[PDB]
């Protein structure tokens, strides 16, 4: 019933510095030739408190998509720290890979992301304002949350 099936996602170049781009290897399948657009997004949850601090890092619009198995490396620049609240910068947050067909999000792949300092001093005495240049990003690649939604194909 669903025209697109997402087979696998691999988190590449992880762990990495905060400023490093996100890299995901996405493998999906089209049962039929797609006449509408397929749009992939990477969204960074800057703040768990509010959706308004989401950063859409990149968007890949594909169309028309021929039937079969497709694989590609979705790469997106690291989020803008100037829009990240200090309280949320260090610790656990979420990154999301969304796919939409005809403007309807049918799959959301979520990863928890732990941004930590590597120098033990900064871990014992974290700077008052987060120093993103010394934050390592650990994408918890072993615990993806794959949520699928019913849409009209």
């Amino acid at each position: 019933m669903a025209k697109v099936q997402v087979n696998n996602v691999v988190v590449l170049d992880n762990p990495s510095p905060f400023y490093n781009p996100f890299q995901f290897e996405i493998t999906f399948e089209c049962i039929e030739d797609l006449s509408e657009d397929l749009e992939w997004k990477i969204i960074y949850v800057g703040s768990a408190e509010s959706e308004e601090y989401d950063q859409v890092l990149d968007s890949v619009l594909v169309g028309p998509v021929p039937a079969g198995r497709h694989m590609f490396v979705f790469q997106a620049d690291a989020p803008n720290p100037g829009l990240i609240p200090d309280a949320d910068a260090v610790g656990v947050t979420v990154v999301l890979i969304t796919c939409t067909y005809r403007g309807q999000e049918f799959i959301r792949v979520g990863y928890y992301v732990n941004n930590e300092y590597t120098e033990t001093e900064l871990r014992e005495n974290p700077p008052v304002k987060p120093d993103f240049s010394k934050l390592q990003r650990n994408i918890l690649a072993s615990n993806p949350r794959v949520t699928r939604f019913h849409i009209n194909w």
Binding site: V92, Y112, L140
Partner: protein, 74 residues
Amino acid sequence: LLIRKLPFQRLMREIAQDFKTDLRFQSSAVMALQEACESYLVGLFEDTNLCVIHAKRVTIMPKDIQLARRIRGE
């Protein structure tokens, strides 16, 4: 079932009245909603534990529940 039936049913009736005063449920539907809510909350807490294992924090905080909700699209 970890959530007792009567208070949960009372909350369901209150929500139903907030939507339609003339509304009614079924025993099987009540139990099904109980199982759904229990599994949903347990999964959320599993995510919170995943969050708190990776943080020097040991107690789970509302931030972990918000993160568990955002990862799922709610």
